[PDB]
């Protein structure tokens, strides 16, 4: 039953449909239509942020959703579903996969990651949980403390992985981790997405290169000077 | 004054923000936000279809707009601002540039293109008019009958130009036309947009590669099989 969720994304594309408050297309309505567009193009899952976006996305597609809640506390640089409070809001709405910052950095509620995951696995025993990590060490650790999925989402986004390449850290993760590794973070060309599967990713997440038109526009503009 | 409009786009990127009725993001609201995103990414103009989209786009950006009205009559394959009726609706709303199918094909109102343009140039003598053409012959003809701009928009979209390449027909148009030639139609990579300027285009229009996420998604999906 949690197996059926992972077979439905095996070897397929997941499109991240996010637009925070600063961003041009910030609107639950638009993110719902972006999800529909990814579906019409052949995507097999959606990654989505906040409950209002997730709800609207559910009206447009019946694709599986990786759900997160980004909230920035002033204690911590851990902000992807960082505390127990975000987990419950997502459990209440219902998503196929809840993704959580699984780096070694200190959390806003100053709770160990080993306990935190033990508490939600005890509390929500049928819920698929995904680990957003930045290094191979953290990906193996996430595996042993009980995560169902890892993702290379935070590669290059921590001090201790500054300038790490997505694909380069992926082939290190994939060769030592046994649970599904989802390639995610700066997979911004179709060719990189092919290489990610050829490296051994279980699925590939693409965000801005599909759903942030201002960042696609800036690529065109900067090569026209 | 019409000169200031063309200097503001010289050597720059125009982003076409369109989504017809069949399409995932069909909504004037979304097309307004897409225009804002192109602006945030560094675009210098917007191409837009229908008055409700143009109006919403005007709320988001003060970039110059190439305005069209696509309407398909059962008489003709000419559908980009095809009759005098669409021209007036756009004149009433007010756009910096009105773009019109300027191919040699028979129009829905069975009026010659030479007269049609003479009537609107007489009627709207300060309005900048752009010629959407498919071949070099039609681009030179558009120039002599009084158009202000030509665009390679319909290259490959007429029986007599089946399989013509955008860039290949562009360098033929640019070497014999004196008025500004805008490269438009299947300019779907940043590199093609650089080559279009290097060929001699006055400006470059990019559409789906920025503003149709389902067609960007399909490029990723098809290279993941
Ligand atoms: Cl994310
Ligand atoms: Cl991130
Ligand atoms: Cl068009
Ligand atoms: Cl077209």
From Swiss-Prot, chains A, B:
Keywords per UniProt: Carbohydrate metabolism, Isomerase
GO molecular function: N-acylglucosamine-6-phosphate 2-epimerase activity
Catalysed reactions, as listed in the record: an N-acyl-D-glucosamine 6-phosphate = an N-acyl-D-mannosamine 6-phosphate
Residues making up the signal peptide according to the UniProt record: none
Isomerase found in the keyword field: yes
SUPFAM superfamilies membership: Ribulose-phoshate binding barrel
Domain of life: Bacteria
InterPro entries: Aldolase_TIM, NanE, RibuloseP-bd_barrel
Enzyme class: isomerase
Cited Pfam families: NanE
EC number: 5.1.3.9
Gene Ontology terms describing biological process: carbohydrate metabolic process; N-acetylmannosamine catabolic process; N-acetylneuraminate catabolic process
NCBIfam families referenced in this protein's UniProt entry, alphabetically: PRK01130.1
Role noted for this protein: Converts N-acetylmannosamine-6-phosphate (ManNAc-6-P) to N-acetylglucosamine-6-phosphate (GlcNAc-6-P).
Record-stated family: Belongs to the NanE family.
Listed name of the protein: Putative N-acetylmannosamine-6-phosphate 2-epimerase
């Amino acid at each position: 039953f949690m197996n059926k969720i992972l077979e439905s994304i095996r070897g397929k594309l997941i499109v991240s449909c996010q637009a925070l408050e600063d961003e041009p297309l910030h609107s639950s309505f638009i993110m719902g239509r972006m999800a529909y567009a990814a579906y019409s193009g052949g995507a097999a899952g959606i990654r989505a942020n906040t409950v209002e976006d997730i709800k609207e996305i559910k009206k447009n597609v019946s694709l599986p959703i990786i759900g997160i809640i980004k909230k920035v506390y002033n204690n911590s640089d851990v902000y992807i579903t960082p505390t127990i409070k975000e987990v419950e809001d997502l459990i209440n709405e219902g998503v196929q996969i809840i993704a959580i910052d699984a780096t070694k950095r200190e959390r806003p509620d100053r709770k160990d990651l080993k306990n935190f995951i033990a508490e939600i696995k005890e509390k929500y025993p049928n819920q698929l949980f995904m680990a957003d990590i930045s290094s191979v060490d953290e990906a193996l650790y996430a595996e042993k403390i009980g995560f169902d999925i890892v993702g290379t989402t935070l590669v290059g986004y921590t001090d201790y992985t500054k300038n790490y390449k997505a694909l380069e850290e992926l082939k290190k993760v994939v060769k030592v981790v046994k649970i599904p590794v989802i390639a995610e973070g700066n997979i911004d060309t179709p060719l990189k997405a092919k290489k990610a599967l050829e490296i051994g990713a279980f699925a590939v997440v693409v965000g801005g290169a599909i759903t942030r038109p201002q960042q696609i526009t800036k690529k065109f503009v900067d090569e026209m000077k």
